[PDB]
Amino acid sequence: KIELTFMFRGQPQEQTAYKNVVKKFEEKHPNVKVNIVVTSPDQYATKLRAAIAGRKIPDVFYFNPGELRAYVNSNVLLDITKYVENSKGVNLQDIWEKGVNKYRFDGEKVGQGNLYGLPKDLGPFALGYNKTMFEKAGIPLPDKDKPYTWQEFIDVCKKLTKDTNGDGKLDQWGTGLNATWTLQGFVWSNGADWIDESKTKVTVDDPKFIEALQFFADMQNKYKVTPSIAEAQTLDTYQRWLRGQLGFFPVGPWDLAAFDQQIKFEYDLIPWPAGSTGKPATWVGSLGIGVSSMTKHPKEAVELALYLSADPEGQKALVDQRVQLPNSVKVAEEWAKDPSIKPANKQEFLDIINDYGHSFPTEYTYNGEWYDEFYRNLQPVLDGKMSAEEYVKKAKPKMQKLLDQAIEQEKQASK
Ligand SMILES: OC[C@@H]1O[C@@H](OC[C@@H]2O[C@@H](OC[C@@H]3O[C@@H](OC[C@@H]4O[C@@H](OC[C@@H]5O[C@@H](OC[C@@H]6O[C@@H](O)[C@H](O)[C@H]6O)[C@H](O)[C@H]5O)[C@H](O)[C@H]4O)[C@H](O)[C@H]3O)[C@H](O)[C@H]2O)[C@H](O)[C@H]1O
Numbered sequence: 164k165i166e167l168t169f170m171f172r173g174q175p176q177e178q179t180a181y182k183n184v185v186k187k188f189e190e191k192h193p194n195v196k197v198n199i200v201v202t203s204p205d206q207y208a209t210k211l212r213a214a215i216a217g218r219k220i221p222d223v224f225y226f227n228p229g230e231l232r233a234y235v236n237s238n239v240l241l242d243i244t245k246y247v248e249n250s251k252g253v254n255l256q257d258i259w260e261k262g263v264n265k266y267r268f269d270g271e272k273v274g275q276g277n278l279y280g281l282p283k284d285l286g287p288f289a290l291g292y293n294k295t296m297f298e299k300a301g302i303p304l305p306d307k308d309k310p311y312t313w314q315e316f317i318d319v320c321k322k323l324t325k326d327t328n329g330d331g332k333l334d335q336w337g338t339g340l341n342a343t344w345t346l347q348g349f350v351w352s353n354g355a356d357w358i359d360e361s362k363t364k365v366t367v368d369d370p371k372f373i374e375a376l377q378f379f380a381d382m383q384n385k386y387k388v389t390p391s392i393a394e395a396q397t398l399d400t401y402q403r404w405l406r407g408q409l410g411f412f413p414v415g416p417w418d419l420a421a422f423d424q425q426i427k428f429e430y431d432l433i434p435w436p437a438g439s440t441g442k443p444a445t446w447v448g449s450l451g452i453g454v455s456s457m458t459k460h461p462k463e464a465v466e467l468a469l470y471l472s473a474d475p476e477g478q479k480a481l482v483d484q485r486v487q488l489p490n491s492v493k494v495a496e497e498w499a500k501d502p503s504i505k506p507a508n509k510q511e512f513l514d515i516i517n518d519y520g521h522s523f524p525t526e527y528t529y530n531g532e533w534y535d536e537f538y539r540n541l542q543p544v545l546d547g548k549m550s551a552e553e554y555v556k557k558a559k560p561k562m563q564k565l566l567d568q569a570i571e572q573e574k575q576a577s578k
């Protein structure tokens with residue numbers, strides 16, 4: 164009888180995981196058929212915006228929490244409050260509250276009110292270290308609790324940076340962080356942010372922001388605890404991490420499957436290094452699972468979303484397949500305490516969610532074009548061809564205009 168379109172994004176391992184779980188779902192609901200539309204993480208936002216622009220919207224789909232408000236105003240998302248209430252036994256309250264609450268909207272704020280999506284997951288971005296090269300080097304292991312200072316972090320990265328096969332060429336580096344996904348921690352840890360408290364002013368020219376930005380770039384260009392620009396060009400640092408060439412690199416729970424398959428060294432999680440604030444910082448990501456407000460099959464569509472987001476047996480298969488941590492708080496707590504399941508300090512993930520993880524800036528803004536503009540022309544700063552001070556001075560009014568326009572578009576689309 165019922166056919167359903169499901170679009171989402173994922174790295175190869177994530178795609179395989181969700182397809183198997185949709186197949187479990189179909190077995191449990193033999194009158195529902197799910198046609199899948201899946202993309203790479205990169206190509207995803209463009210395709211969804213084209214589907215929405217043409218009002219050819221999938222029954223069920225992934226979406227950015229920072230688009231909730233705009234999606235609601237434009238009538239993109241079905242209000243699913245009652246379909247989830249009347250579901251069998253499902254207890255959304257067992258799910259992470261910061262997760263579920265990203266997809267609530269009472270007409271004026273995102274804190275409370277009706278449900279317009281379910282959280283796919285929470286994605287704490289932890290720091291990982293290669294325990295195998297640390298030991299082989301004779302370097303004391305990092306503290307599981309007490310974060311490196313920036314200076315300390317650079318020191319160890321230096322000791323980890325060397326020519327190990329004695330051919331005269333460096334073949335191992337302390338680290339190689341990707342600014343797109345790892346600059347936030349340093350900014351936030353240094354007491355800065357992309358925007359102010361009100362979330363209406365751009366603050367990337369705060370001296371604290373500049374200092375963190377400069378420190379990030381300097382680890383490739385000045386401290387040289389990084390493969391060179393050319394070397395990174397030859398093989399990106401993600402890949403070099405997988406190959407065992409890097410001391411440190413981030414780890415999200417969506418990595419665990421890929422890492423099971425490729426990483427041969429022992430590795431574990433630690434807090435991110437801390438800037439002036441003394442406190443570690445990093446992000447906790449999330450994607451929403453929403454339902455087309457114009458789906459012909461709201462009941463069944465909500466049923467597919469619930470199965471992926473909260474259903475005990477649907478959650479279980481996704482965690483088994485190592486592409487996320489459990490959405491149920493209590494389950495994740497016993498998951499984090501289970502020693503048979505690597506890495507050892509899985510607990511760090513939860514620590515990031517409860518204590519020292521933050522949201523992306525765009526989650527507070529009506530759209531994120533202002534933020535995308537910061538990263539669009541950032542590469543010359545990363546490659547040392549201009550300072551952090553002069554890029555952010557040049558780029559701040561560009562991104563204040565975009566932010567002003569986003570605030571204006573939310574007045575206009577919501578009245
Ligand atoms: O070093 C310079 C760069 O290297 C070259 O690019 C190489 C890159 O390496 C490969 O990427 C490795 C992955 O990247 C990191 O993961 C970051 C992103 O997370 C994954 O999705 C998980 C998903 O996101 C979470 O939520 C995040 C946000 O929160 C919301 O506000 C918003 O909606 C979300 O965006 C969810 O919790 C979770 O489910 C993506 O797959 C990944 O991009 C990890 O280190 C690895 O997973 C890849 O080949 C290249 O991108 C370039 O030359 C240079 O830029």
Ligand SMILES: [Ca+2]
Pocket residue numbers: 326327328329330331332333334
């Ligand atoms: Ca060498």
